[PDB]
Amino acid sequence: AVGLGAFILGFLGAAGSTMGAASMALTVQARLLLSQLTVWGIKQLQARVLAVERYLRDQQLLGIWGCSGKIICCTNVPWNDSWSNKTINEIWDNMTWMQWEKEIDNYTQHIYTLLEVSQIQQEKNEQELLELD
Amino acid sequence: AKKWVTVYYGVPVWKEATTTLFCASDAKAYDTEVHNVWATHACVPTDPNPQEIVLGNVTENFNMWKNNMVEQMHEDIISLWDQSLKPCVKLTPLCVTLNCNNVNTNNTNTGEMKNCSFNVTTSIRDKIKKEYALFYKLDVVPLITNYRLINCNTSVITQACPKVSFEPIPIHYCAPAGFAILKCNSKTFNGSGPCTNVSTVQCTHGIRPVVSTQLLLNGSLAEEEIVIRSENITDNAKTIIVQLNEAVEINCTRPNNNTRKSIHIGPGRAFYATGDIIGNIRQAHCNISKARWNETLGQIVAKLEEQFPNKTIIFNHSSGGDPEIVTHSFNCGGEFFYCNTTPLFNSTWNNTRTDDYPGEQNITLQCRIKQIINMWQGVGKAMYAPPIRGQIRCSSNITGLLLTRDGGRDQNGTETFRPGGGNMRDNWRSELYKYKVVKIEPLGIAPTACKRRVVQ
Amino acid sequence: EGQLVQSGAELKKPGASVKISCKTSGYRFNFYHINWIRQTAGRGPEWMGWISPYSGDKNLAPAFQDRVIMTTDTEVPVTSFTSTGAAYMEIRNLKFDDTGTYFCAKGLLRDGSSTWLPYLWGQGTLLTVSSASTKGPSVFPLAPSSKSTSGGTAALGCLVKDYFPEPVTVSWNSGALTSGVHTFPAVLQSSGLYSLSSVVTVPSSSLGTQTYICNVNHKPSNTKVDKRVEPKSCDKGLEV
């Protein structure tokens, strides 16, 4: 509200949904931001509890990677070319997140552990080891 | 030039799944008291302006027949009936034998309303009184004494509370936070295929839960030409859902000025029966403009003739169905009409054009009315519609109609189309042919050239 | 993977027009541009224009901005990430110097600084512009000749002579025989008619177990010739 011109590009983000186009202005925002014993009272309660559960799962993964409050967090785990041969320009200028997910879906479960142990498990030890002195 | 993985929260990635949605209506009770049972007063009120995101460059397969949204909506309608009839009066003490007479009128050249008399236990158990009531002919069957009620041997009977209304109110189906509804926006969408244009919405549109047989009322109109939808049109056993662009206006009435008679049958269980009729005696009917139904059937025969090269032969209707399936059953003003759709499907066309039609006469269909119904082919509790005081009048737009292609022996029998619902759920598939439920997976990893600040 | 198949070679008189097709598959037709590149012997390769199948935007070179009409058809989905498309290009007021091969090319990247770049190319649509008329070819059988006396190999084939349209197709046993076949480029006679040859090397002992038939198809004349090569030779090195 009350934001014209100087703020209107603020609504038009850029580098976020830059992997091709299988999205729109609020394809990201339609999920992140859109939040009596009858059948509608029971079905709604299971829908609210499911929403909370699915939210805390993602944020927990983010927490156990060192990425809790972050949207774009970098990591110290290198990219193994066994997962992808392509370059940064073949990925971000030629594919959409929908089909990039479909490709790396094989190694996706593996990288999740690598994010957990190879860094934020090590970082929190290294940072505690070196803050002894 | 190195490559490190980088996590991204909020990526436009979705997978197809099924979840438990919830209702969403518009108005409540203090503006319209005791307004609905189909779309109850309890579900979340819809937001003032809906948010619809049209998804460019997106192409995804839909399927109206394998969609689980019609399965959930079907079981929501069924279960919403039990919770409403549960506390209301059961008509168990009303299967005593019935001494029935016919209605008194002059000689003609039979009757539809009848007049039955029976004795029932008063509110006091030991004492008994004899009462009279007028039950429609399709509610009594013979067994010295004439009739009994129809549903006795089959199952129990429960009278719906007169406070509730059987009005279809637009109800929305909304997916929970974390899921999404993808909506096909193509002007002529195949039954089950890829949609070139997709949108996403948190909720569906105003889907009036109109229970109807053979004809679809108050539905959604396609905006260009008409659409024929079948899971397999070469397969005769697959139902055919049709959709129109210009809906045909229908008009129906029950002219008899009935009355409401309250017969006490138990403690605080006042049963309501049709009292004596007032004024003229005449049956219920439905008017359909002949000029509009001819053009509509003219538009339907065109698309049918494009799917079949030899132009076949035009169809008739209504084989194999004794009660609810053959008639065009639909609610109006509270009573359940059962129309005879023979004036509509008695035609024959060839090379388009016309035949079997002769001005501007309203097409009239003699519609019989019942009060005992067991809906959705459900074995068990059957509802007794209470009588409606005064004269009944309604009107509706017919947007679609269900047909069924018939096949004769092996070959060369030539084919017609008997209208008939292959299942109850086919009414909902006409409104959920475009919506699909999907879940969002917003966590995406991808390689960039950034490395997190080194251990320090 | 993604593939592009153009129309066949055509012949048109100077003054008329031609419309070449380019039917794509394997990829989302709307995601990438479609370029049109021709190569004439007088000026080498020359870029004509591109069109955006998605939007409909087109960019024509100044040397083709008055005589080229590019269009595309709407994509037909195959899966959620592929489709089949069709792009067309129409050149008007053909001249003799327009003679050459014409290519359609798929774009390179969806977004960036070189999106439209010609990446996946078509197989070629040779367009000849002349005042003469189409002439069908005359096929003659080539007698077997000795290739290696100690190795026991020979060589036989067919001969195409005096045909004006440039495209030429030679197949053996309706495509059954593909190993050992060698087809040579055409020669430009002083009269303006082309001629070439096609030969296949086969063992000398294969005379009574294999049948060798060449299938020459000259589509601009709509003539199919099926000649049976006589396996009886007259070379002294092969008779031994």
Place this chain on the structure above:
Amino acid sequence: SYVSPLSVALGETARISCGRQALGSRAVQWYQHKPGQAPILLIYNNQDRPSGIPERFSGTPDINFGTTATLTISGVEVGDEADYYCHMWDSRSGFSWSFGGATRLTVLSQPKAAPSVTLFPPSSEELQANKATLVCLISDFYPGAVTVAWKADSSPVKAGVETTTPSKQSNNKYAASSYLSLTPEQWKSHKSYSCQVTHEGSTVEKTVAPT
């Protein structure tokens, strides 16, 4: 079963209801009958009147249901006094064979009038048949009520006296007569005979004597 009465002022507007009220859409007819004369149809369709029926009469049509069928007459004169019948044809009933109950309309309020009496003696040919009857006529009297008293000489007769119940004529007045059977010897023996017609306040008398 029989006929019912009704009293209406002269020149004012009248309202004749109808028995057996309608159950559905009604088609009522209204017949105007006079005893001994032919009935005349005023209204066939509930609002329609055939040619010759004056505009004074009017029926209530059943445009909206619940109305009750009433025949209304304006400017009631003596010529309107007659039996009225209401034929009831509604959709719920069958074939209404019997006509409605007659409504005996009576009118009141008129100017004064005096009758004219003409008593005549028995003729000569009557006396030849060994009989003799006196004949006393009464014409144009004000109200039906009238009492005829005979007088043989100055004494009343009281025997063999027969008088008419007054009935209305074409001139909207009533007419009546009175007879007195006698023997030829009783007619000749008396000096004179007197027929005294007492009407309302006044009393007229005619006297005739033998020759």
Place this chain on the structure above:
Amino acid sequence: SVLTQSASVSGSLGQSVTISCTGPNSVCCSHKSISWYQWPPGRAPTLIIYEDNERAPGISPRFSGYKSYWSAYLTISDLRPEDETTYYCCSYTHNSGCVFGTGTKVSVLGQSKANPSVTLFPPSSEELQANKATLVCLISDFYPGAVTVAWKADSSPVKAGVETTTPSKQSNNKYAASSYLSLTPEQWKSHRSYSCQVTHEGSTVEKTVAPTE
């Protein structure tokens, strides 16, 4: 063409070679993007260097791209037998279209010689029936680029009806060519033998056919 490339260039087997691509300010190198295409004669070209230095997908790291403010360069390292063909550069931007250059033909030196294969065919009997006679001399499988053909009638030069094709490249990195000699049956019958003489820079192969056989 305003975009000028080197006319020709050559390098040894396993050595490296460099192609130049430059032109006027309308096609200058400072502000325009330069792409490179390996365009064999007759076949569809193949992108190798999409921006100034980023190579196309699936391109060996042997191809390098460099561009100065005054000339763009393509460098082929560890040369192969298949790297001997025509190459073109394209000058463009994000919205404009390609501008192809003059072209460069790379030669691969430090090679293994290949003995040519010659085959001569006499005209068939069906051709002689139509009063036509054409000699067919085919050459293939020779690595040296050029070949010269000289026809002889009874060991005497022939200068009428001699049509020789340009040397093409074989799928096995070799080369091939063909030469035809149209004759009349009077000249074909009144001679003892005809000869197809193919001459290379290291050896001259001769094949002879006789009308008597």
Place this chain on the structure above:
Amino acid sequence: QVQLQESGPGLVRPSETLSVTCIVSGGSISNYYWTWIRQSPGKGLEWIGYISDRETTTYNPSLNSRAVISRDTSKNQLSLQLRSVTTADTAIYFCATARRGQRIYGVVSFGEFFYYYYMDVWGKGTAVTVSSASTKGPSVFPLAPSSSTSGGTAALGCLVKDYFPEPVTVSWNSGALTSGVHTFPAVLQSSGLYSLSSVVTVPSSSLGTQTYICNVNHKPSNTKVDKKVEP
């Protein structure tokens, strides 16, 4: 434009077949409907039945066991006969031209319409008395003028002695004189028979050479009597 005339016996012996006839002069009998309505004294009008233009009968259910209606095609007349009459069947009979009307209260295809008849033309009406008793003819006596009032206005008349039935027609000079005529209603004498008379008021200037002769016509007694009235 339609005139009806009733003709009948007038007297019927009990337990016999009363007959009557209704002659039509307006139009065709196969073009209209016809119905009979009798009028007994002291009771209301009674509908006994009707006949259609296609000639198929149906009668009032009370009298249906004894009434028969038939129409003649050659002669524009309507016949009505009554079997086993009593003294109740004693009545003034009316033949009337009925009209069929259709009152529709819904859709025509599903019935929802009833027919209703109305008689818009009525005949003069004939009287029929049923009794075993015989006829008695009337005798006419002249009424000499009072040799009456000032202005030379005299009043004469002609008397009709006791007659058996009330049906009586009286005319003056074969109907030539119509001004001043005033026939009085019949008085039921204790002898069981009625007796009326007529009067005429004429000027005294024409009271001498008037030659007035009143004509008394009576149908049940079959007698027509003329009488001269002179001072």
